[PDB]
Design a protein around this ligand. Structure first.
Ligand code: 17F
Ligand code: 17F
Length: 1800
């Protein structure tokens, strides 16, 4: 098994990283349970409320009468909404009050006092024409008969008992308004008395509270012409007839004493002998006197003082409308205003306009509501404002008067309003918005797992360790499938444990959790392969965490701005904005929440069917999410093939079409080195041999071991060791050998002893359970070279296997390699030549892309070496030494004449003659008198051969230095067109977007708009239903109503044909005509909300309400349905939820289709005889007419009028729909206009004249403008927050330049080597304001670019310009110290943006101290007075309130000057501008704090004495340093040199103390760090020149010294900006050498020693001696061997702070050494007898190396084991013992240094 064990290993790895971090795993599983245990608690504190079916009673308008109007004003003040239909919704019946006391009184009075007994009463009274008396047996007889017959008829015994009972009561707590409210309807000195009386009952004051404007307030009418007075006399005729209740008290008081004075004299004389002569009724006549006049006077004593509280006058003229507004606002604060009629226009058209208050008329900027509420919108206070405010009670007083004036012919048709019935429903505000708050709460709940998958995928690539698996045989199918199946772990487990929360905490009940899980487990396979695609762009694992969450939440906001404008969203633009995955979950979630409002959720059998018409099902959403996963991790398997990163080869425009060599021969037993050049030759050959790309780039084409193109054969034979430590962090040491063992062939049982063998051979068997985070940095590299040898490899390619390693571990690595070579082949390729000399074999070098030479280093020394050299160890005279050297062989030379030593150049042919022992036996006899203590031998070093064979194939002088900083910062600005100008464009873009976003919201206070009342809703349905057609008059009004609706006049063709039913469906017919119904019968029922099946509106079958009624269509688009003789409160209930169904998709601006309609019909069917009472009063008008109209006969006129005008009244119910806000008055207006064009004589279609009304509320006041304005003044707060955020943004781009430039070169070379901090640390500020000034102005002009804030004038922006100029002068010092305190590289950018956002949100909540409430003791004023002073220490926030208050003052002055008189502008005044200038004009103090950080240098010659280090280092002499570091060695030199602090003891810093003498401490010490001291982005020598010319130049030494640095550095021939590997530390050290032209001081420096090729290091280690040769100090740090051999002296090594050694390297090689090295080449069939010969001549001479004929021998000094004999006998006796060619040297002191490595 190959794939299915690579997958098990690659999936066990991800499980082991996911197990060792159990706060990653626990937090990412309890975080989506702190987001969905908030929704469970917001659900259980807003439960659904379910309401029954409301049927409402009717509200008659004053056209109906004055007793029905007052009954429907006082009684049904509440809109009770009965569940059974009221008696005023059924056809014919009109008034639902025929059991109250008033209506029974009028009924009995009309049926008795107009009855048939009054007929014979008037017949008896007609006999009195005789001359008897002017006020006889037979007229007395007839009158007695008739009156006695009528006596029992007035014993009506059913209402008058109740009236006498109600009037004669004790007082009680019955208020003077609650007294009438038992009689009307059953289930100002005179006003102020009852006003005090009414307070005892809250219902009484709640009825008076809005009855008060109608009976106190006044009414005003504007243009005051003859026409207007002629009209408003008719409106005053309504309040005139209410003062006929009062003059009957006048008639009663002039009649009452006349009756009462007929007592005790007339009762005996004047009536007793006239009445009592003749049973029951003569006994009733005398039993009547006591309670007759007293009770009717007690009745009229109350009735008549109600007229005394009504004003006599309510009308009052005006000159014009502009005086009406002023007089109105005068009267309104007097508490006496009803309304103001304003007539209008310049013929017959009338243009009435009612201007009311604004707490009293409904507001007029909308015709509907934004968010559909499923109520009936019938609440008596908050949305019937036309009814209790009194708009519609005044409308059809005025309309009826205009109808009566424009036409003549007093119409009579009373109007009754009637709201429509409404079905059973539920109100559930949580689930109406769940399509908007479920996507948000799961985009945030899975944003922590998306950042963990992007972090893991990118760190498997940043650490160069996806490369070391794909170069180990692994696929790219496997690597990506192991990330898919393992990042779908927690995603698919936290989407199976929040389905329980949804179904079980009732967020989505009635659903079935299978269908919800399988829709949340296709969103989770489309967000895994999105966090892969987001990680195909990045290469850093810490930027990726902070951009994965941001680009996962930035893909959701296209759903937020797509649910808002959902109405105008075409369905193609919704199946193509579902190609972002957090949006296709939006449109599936809005369709899973439309199936909850229909009772049954997402079950298995509706998961293919769309709920409403233009929505998705759930199967189309899951299909879109899988398509949207497929083509979305299909980009990754393309995008990483054409942009792999920056290590790796691209492969553009894919289709799926699909040891040896020419040059070398590596052998089967050697340890071949490969040291050529890090150029075009070396890294390509190991790449081709390691097979990562096919070969075409020059070098060679012979396939190496088996076959280059059959790589899977030799992939289990060779192992590579890369540069990087191939090592997983959180896997322990044993599991690495296990993992790379099982991945590379070997079965699961043969891998067993392999762990034992490796962990024994590397030296790690104790710590075989430590994670490899917890390993020292040279123990990892010695493990990571041991897992190249696993599985028995043979052709092991190593690749620099010692870089950056502590030298003890570097010898451990060499021991490991030297034992692992006997049966293998090693091709290690290093730079440092000590390895290739020491552990070398046949050494091959390449140069220029081709092979240069190869062979053993002895062979290369034979045919390329110069020859032997002799050095002398100890001015006597040079030519005597020349003669002594040229005594034997005259071809020699003495190359360097030094006073300390000499070095010769001898020919190696000179020793080939056997002339060695002659030389040194004479020198053994001559060194006694040459004044020299000894000699030593040397060969040509291997680096000489290497370089030589490479040669074949290859007061004003301080202010001109601002410019030195300025051009480096200027070129930083100029060259960074790829990572910058996000510091300029971003704030202008954000301030433009913020000002554009301040356009959607209209301002407040602009209620009063003209609003033509007629029907304005557009296309609509509106019915009608004629009740009784018997009379010709109301057959005209019907036609006029239709011609109002838009119906044409009926032509002579199809004359009885305008209406026609649609097609009834047949199933409807066979379900209707089988339950035996007629249009007055109930229809089939509809199903309400069962216990456990709640739903908004009921589920109605198709035959609910009946067949469709005979409709017709107009031309304006108004369906008009004939609905005559059907049950009209059964049709309107059962067809409501199917008219409004397209508005149940979005629930915003819902066009309900049917808004109202009419219902005609004559008077109430019931009690007859409207003309009998008039006949009775007309007959009883005889004999009683004293005053013809003198306040007595007017009673008789109005009583005859009240009788005669009773039977001929029409009706109109007006059904309205209150969710349209203006339907009440639209249809009252159409009714009045249609009554007008019916009494026109020529034809009802009269096109001359027409009533219109408007609705224009009255001018607002100061607390009415300002309160609504400050409530609306919140989008400008968002504008201000965006302004302060975007303008605080770009200094966080400024400080990035200082983040990686803290201390690294400028602070510790440019400011310390010559001590100039004074310019630099304020010149950063100067350059920041210099390059802030233009991104200030370029943000200033975005105000002007969009006409949304700027508005050109001196009053706005004379100082906001200066405000936006001083922001960056202020903000610059207070946010530098993220750089030079708590150094973090490019990671606290999130922190800096967050803290500026925290400043902005403190400024945001600063001014919002008030929302609705306030307290008593000036606490808000004290809090805003404290925030006035709170701007003192916070320069980022004080402005953030001044911009707010300045915008408010701007708009305040604009309003108060464009509405009222002229006030002073305050553009510069103290409360906004001068105090802010005084606050902000001190950032130099913060600049001094920032520079005082540098004056403390931080956030707030060598004598060592037991710090047993007995070290004396004198200045002026070079000193060496080797050994180990990191144990307290470099730190010890740091606390010597001042980087670190020591706690106890004493410290010497050049004889100067720190806290005692600051001047001597600053001036006398300069110490370069070891932290790769460079600013990486430069352009080369010219930075170095200009930092040199920061000191002492008359603008002319720049050229001289730049020419010197160009001439003396030959490494400047390359590009004007070099690459970075070519430049760097070598030019930096040459720059320091150039900087010491003015430095005669100690230059003890860390010398970082960047590991470059030795070609430039020849010039470096020559010129560092050649420049500093004056006798001053030279300091360098050695870590490899050749730089120790280049320039060293007496060297110090710390061994736990103890010295066990001391000496210069000549002293070290004299005392501590081990003699000489014999290098020898013999054939292997002769080598061990040659070793026997060596042991014969040298019994006991030590041998170190013996392999392949390569023999090395260690020769101790003393006797024959020393020099002077050995090469002589090897020339004599060793010549015939198989030796062909060999050389000797003194011991190269790596192995002498092995004792120094064994010291520790
Ligand atoms: C950086 C950009 C960020 C992008 C984010 C913006 C997009 C989405 C953000 C938030 C989601 C919601 C968006 C903000 C509000 C959404 C709309 C809103 O809620 O307005 C006020 C609502 C009134 O609306 P309705 O629900 O009555 O709607 C009428 C009708 N059904 C319809 O379909 O329209 O009254 C109420 O809130 C009910 C109060 C009493 C019961 C409350 C109970 C229910 C209320 C809330 C439920 C939990 C939501 C909590 C939200 C807090 C986080 C903001
Ligand atoms: C109002 C509600 C706001 C909700 C915001 C949710 C954010 C996280 C919520 C709670 C965190 C819980 C508190 C933190 C827990 C403390 C522990 C902690 O710091 O974790 C850091 C983790 C560590 O994982 P690693 O990356 O090191 O490796 C994990 C790897 N995959 C593996 O398992 O092998 O990496 C990270 O996540 C670093 C990023 C930090 C996470 C935030 C990353 C978010 C970054 C940017 C997006 C923020 C919000 C989006 C911007 C506007 C939204 C308003």
């Amino acid at each position: 098994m190959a794939f299915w064990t690579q997958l098990m290993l690659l999936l066990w790895k991800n499980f082991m990283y996911r197990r060792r971090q159990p706060v990653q795993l626990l937090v990412e599983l309890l975080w989506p349970l702190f987001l969905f245990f908030i929704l469970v608690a917001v659900r259980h504190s807003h439960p659904p409320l379910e309401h029954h079916e409301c049927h409402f009673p009717n509200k008659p308008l004053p056209s109906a009468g004055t007793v029905p109007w007052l009954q429907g004003l006082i009684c049904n003040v509440n809109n009770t909404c009965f569940p059974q239909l009221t008696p005023g919704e059924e056809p014919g019946r009109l008034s639902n009050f025929n059991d109250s006391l008033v209506s029974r009184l009028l009924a009995d009075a009309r049926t008795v006092l107009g009855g048939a007994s009054a007929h014979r009463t008037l017949a008896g009274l007609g006999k009195l024409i005789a001359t008897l008396r002017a006020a006889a047996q037979e007229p007395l007889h007839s009158l007695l008969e008739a009156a006695e017959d009528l006596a029992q008829e007035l014993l009506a015994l059913r209402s008058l008992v109740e009236l006498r009972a109600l009037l004669q009561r004790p007082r009680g707590t019955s208020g003077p308004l609650e007294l009438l409210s038992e009689a009307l309807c059953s289930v100002s000195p005179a006003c102020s008395e009852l006003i005090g009386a009414l307070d005892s009952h809250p219902l009484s004051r709640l009825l008076w509270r809005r009855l008060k404007p109608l009976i106190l307030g006044k009414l005003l009418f504007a243009p005051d012409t003859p026409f207007t007075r002629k009209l408003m006399a008719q409106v005053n005729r309504t309040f005139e007839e209410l003062t006929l209740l009062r003059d009957v008290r006048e008639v009663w008081e002039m009649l009452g004493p006349r009756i009462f004075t007929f007592m005790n004299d007339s009762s005996n004389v004047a009536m007793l002998q006239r009445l009592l002569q003749m049973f029951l009724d003569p006994g009733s006549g005398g039993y009547s006197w006591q309670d007759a006049h007293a009770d009717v006077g007690h009745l009229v004593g109350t009735l008549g003082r109600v007229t005394e509280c009504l004003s006599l006058d309510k009308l009052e003229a005006a000159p014009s409308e502009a005086a009406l507004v002023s007089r109105a606002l005068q009267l309104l604060a007097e508490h006496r205003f009803w309304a103001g009629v304003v007539f209008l226009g310049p013929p017959g058209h009338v243009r009435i306009k009612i201007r009311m208050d604004i707490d009293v008329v409904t507001r007029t900027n909308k015709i509907r509501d934004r968010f559909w509420d499923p109520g009936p919108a019938a609440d008596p206070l908050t949305d019937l404002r036309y009814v209790w405010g009194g708009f519609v009670y005044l409308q059809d007083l005025v309309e009826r008067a205009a109808v009566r004036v424009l036409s003549g012919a007093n119409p009579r048709a009373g109007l009754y309003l009637q709201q429509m019935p409404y079905p059973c429903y539920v109100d559930d505000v949580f689930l109406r918005v769940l399509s908007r708050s479920l996507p948000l709460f799961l985009t945030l709940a899975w944003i922590y797992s998306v950042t963990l998958t992007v972090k893991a995928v990118v760190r498997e690539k940043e650490t160069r360790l996806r490369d070391t698996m794909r170069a180990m045989g692994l696929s790219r199918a496997v690597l990506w499938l192991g990330w898919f199946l393992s990042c779908l772990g927690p995603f698919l487990l936290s989407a199976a444990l929040l389905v329980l929360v949804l179904k079980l905490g009732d967020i989505l009940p009635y659903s079935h959790p299978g269908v919800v899980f399988l829709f949340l487990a296709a969103f989770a396979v489309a967000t895994v392969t999105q966090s892969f695609l987001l990680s195909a762009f990045f290469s850093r694992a810490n930027l990726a965490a902070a951009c994965g969450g941001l680009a996962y939440f930035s893909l959701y906001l296209p759903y937020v701005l797509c649910v808002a404008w959902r109405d105008r969203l075409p369905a193609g633009g919704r199946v193509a904005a579902s190609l972002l995955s957090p949006v296709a979950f939006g449109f599936g979630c809005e369709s899973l929440a439309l199936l909850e409002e229909q009772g049954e959720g997402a079950q298995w059998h509706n998961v293919g069917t769309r709920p409403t018409a233009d929505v998705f099902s759930l199967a189309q959403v899951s299909g879109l999410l899988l398509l949207d996963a497929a083509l979305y991790g299909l980009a990754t398997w393309y995008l990483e093939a054409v942009c792999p990163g920056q290590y790796g080869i691209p492969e553009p425009w894919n289709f799926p079409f699909r040891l040896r060599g020419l040059s070398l021969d590596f052998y089967q037993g050697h340890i071949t080195a490969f040291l050529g050049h890090n150029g075009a030759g070396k890294t390509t050959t190991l790449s081709i041999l390691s097979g990562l790309f096919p070969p075409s780039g020059g070098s060679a084409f012979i396939l190496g071991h088996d076959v280059r193109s059959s790589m899977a054969a030799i992939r289990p034979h060779l192992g590579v060791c890369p540069q990087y430590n191939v090592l997983f962090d959180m896997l322990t040491v044993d599991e690495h050998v296990w993992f790379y063992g099982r991945l590379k062939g070997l079965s699961a049982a043969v891998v067993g002893p392999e762990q034992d063998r490796l962990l024994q051979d590397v030296g790690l068997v104790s710590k075989q359970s430590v994670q490899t985070r917890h390993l020292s940095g040279g123990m990892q590299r010695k493990l990571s070279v041991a897992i190249a040898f696993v599985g028995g490899s043979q052709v092991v390619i190593l690749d620099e296997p010692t870089a950056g390693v502590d030298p003890a571990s570097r010898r451990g690595i060499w021991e490991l390699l030297l034992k692992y070579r006997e049966g293998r082949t090693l091709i290690l390729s290093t730079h440092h030549l000590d390895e290739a000399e020491l552990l070398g074999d046949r050494v091959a070098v390449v140069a220029g892309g081709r092979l240069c030479c190869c062979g053993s280093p002895l062979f290369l020394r034979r045919h390329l070496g110069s020859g032997y050299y002799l050095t002398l160890v100890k001015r006597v005279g040079t030519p005597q030494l020349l003669a002594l050297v040229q005594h034997w062989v005259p071809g020699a030379r003495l190359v360097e004449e030094l006073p300390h030593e000499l070095v010769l150049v001898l020919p190696y042919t000179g020793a080939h003659d056997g002339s060695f022992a002659t030389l040194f036996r004479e020198l053994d006899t001559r060194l006694a008198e040459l004044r020299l203590t000894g000699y030593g031998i040397s060969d040509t070093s291997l680096e000489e051969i290497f370089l030589k064979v490479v040669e074949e194939c290859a007061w004003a002088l301080t202010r001109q230095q601002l410019q030195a900083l300025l051009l480096k910062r200027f070129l930083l600005a100029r060259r960074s067109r790829r990572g910058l100008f996000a510091q300029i464009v971003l704030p202008a873009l954000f301030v433009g977007l913020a000002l554009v976003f301040s356009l959607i919201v209209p301002p407040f206070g602009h209620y009063p708009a003209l609003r033509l009342s007629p029907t304005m809703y557009g296309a609509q349905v509106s019915f009608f239903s004629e009740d009784a057609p018997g009379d010709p008059g109301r057959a005209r009004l019907l036609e006029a109503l239709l011609q109002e609706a838009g119906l044409e006049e009926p032509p002579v063709q199809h004359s009885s044909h305008r209406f026609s039913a649609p097609e009834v469906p047949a199933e409807v017919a066979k379900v209707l005509a089988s339950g035996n119904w007629t249009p007055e019968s109930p229809s089939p029922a509809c199903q309400c909300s069962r216990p456990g099946a709640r739903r908004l509106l009921p589920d109605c079958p198709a035959a609910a309400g009946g067949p469709p009624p005979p409709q017709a269509v107009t031309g304006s688009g108004e369906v008009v349905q004939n609905l005559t003789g059907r049950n009209l409160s059964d049709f309107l209930v059962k067809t409501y939820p199917r008219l409004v169904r397209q508005g149940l998709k979005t629930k915003k601006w819902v066009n309900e289709v049917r808004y109202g309609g009419f219902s005609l019909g004559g008077r109430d069917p019931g009690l007859p005889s409207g003309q009998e009472l008039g006949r009775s009063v007309e007959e009883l008008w005889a004999l009683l007419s004293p005053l013809p109209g003198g306040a007595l006969d007017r009673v008789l006129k109005n009583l005859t009028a009240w009788a005669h005008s009773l039977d001929a009244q029409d009706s109109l119910k007006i059904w309205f729909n209150n969710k349209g806000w203006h339907s009440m008055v639209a249809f009252v207006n159409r009714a009045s206009n249609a009554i007008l064009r019916a009494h026109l004589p020529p034809g009802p279609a009269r096109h001359a004249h027409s009533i219109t009304t408007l609705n224009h509320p009255l001018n607002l006041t100061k607390e009415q403008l300002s309160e609504g304005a400050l409530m609306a003044s919140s989008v400008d707060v968002l504008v201000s927050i965006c302004v302060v955020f975007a303008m605080s943004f770009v200094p966080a781009s400024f400080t990035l330049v200082l983040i990686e430039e803290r201390v690294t070169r400028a602070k510790h070379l440019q400011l310390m080597g010559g001590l100039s901090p004074t310019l630099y640390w304020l010149g950063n500020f100067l350059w920041d304001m210099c390059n802030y000034l233009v991104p200030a102005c370029i943000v200033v002009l975005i105000f002007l670019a969009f006409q949304q804030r700027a508005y050109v004038a001196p009053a706005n922006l004379p100082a906001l310009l200066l405000l936006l100029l001083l922001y960056g002068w202020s903000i610059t010092p207070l946010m530098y110290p993220a750089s030079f305190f708590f150094s973090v590289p490019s990671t606290a950018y999130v922190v800096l943006t967050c803290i500026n956002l925290f400043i902005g949100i403190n400024g945001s909540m600063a001014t919002f101290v008030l929302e609705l409430f306030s307290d008593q003791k000036l606490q808000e004023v004290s809090r805003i007075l404290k925030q006035v002073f709170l701007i003192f220490p916070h320069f980022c926030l004080g402005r953030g309130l001044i911009d707010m208050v300045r915008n408010q003052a701007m708009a305040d002055a604009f309003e108060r000057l464009g509405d009222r008189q002229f006030q002073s502008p305050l553009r510069w005044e103290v409360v906004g501008k001068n105090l802010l200038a005084m606050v902000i004009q001190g950032p130099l103090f913060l600049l001094f704090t920032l520079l005082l950080q540098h004056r403390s240098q931080l956030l707030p010659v060598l004598v060592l004495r037991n710090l047993r280090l007995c070290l004396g280092i004198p200045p002026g002499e070079c000193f060496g340093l080797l050994g180990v570091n990191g144990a307290g060695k470099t730190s010890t030199f740091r606390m010597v040199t001042g980087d670190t602090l020591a706690s106890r003891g004493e410290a010497v810093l050049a004889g100067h103390s720190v806290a005692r003498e600051p001047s001597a401490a600053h001036l006398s010490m300069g110490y370069c760090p070891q932290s790769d001291a460079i600013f990486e982005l430069l352009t080369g020598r010219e930075h170095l020149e200009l930092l040199a010319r920061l000191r002492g130049v008359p603008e002319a030494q720049v050229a001289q010294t730049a020419g010197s640095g160009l001439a003396r550095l030959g490494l400047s021939w390359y590009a004007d900006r070099p690459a970075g590997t070519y430049s760097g530390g070598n030019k930096r050290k040459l720059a320091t050498a150039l900087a010491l032209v003015g430095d005669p001081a100690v230059v003890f420096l860390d010398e970082p020693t960047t590991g470059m090729d030795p070609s430039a290091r020849r010039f470096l280690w020559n010129s560092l001696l050649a420049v500093v040769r004056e006798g001053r100090s030279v300091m360098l740090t050695s870590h490899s061997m050749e730089e120790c051999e280049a320039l060293c002296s007496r060297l110090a090594i710390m061994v736990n702070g103890r010295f066990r050694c001391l000496g210069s390297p000549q002293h070290l090689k004299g005392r501590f050494a081990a003699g000489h090295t014999l290098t020898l080449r013999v054939p292997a069939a002769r080598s061990q007898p040659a070793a026997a010969f060596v042991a014969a001549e040298f019994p006991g001479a030590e041998l170190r190396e013996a392999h392949g004929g390569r023999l090395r021998f260690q020769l101790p000094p003393g006797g024959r084991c020393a020099l002077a004999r050995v090469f002589g006998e090897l020339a004599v006796h060793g010549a015939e013992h198989g030796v062909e060619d060999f050389s000797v040297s003194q011991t190269m002191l790596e192995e002498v240094f092995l004792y120094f490595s064994k010291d520790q």
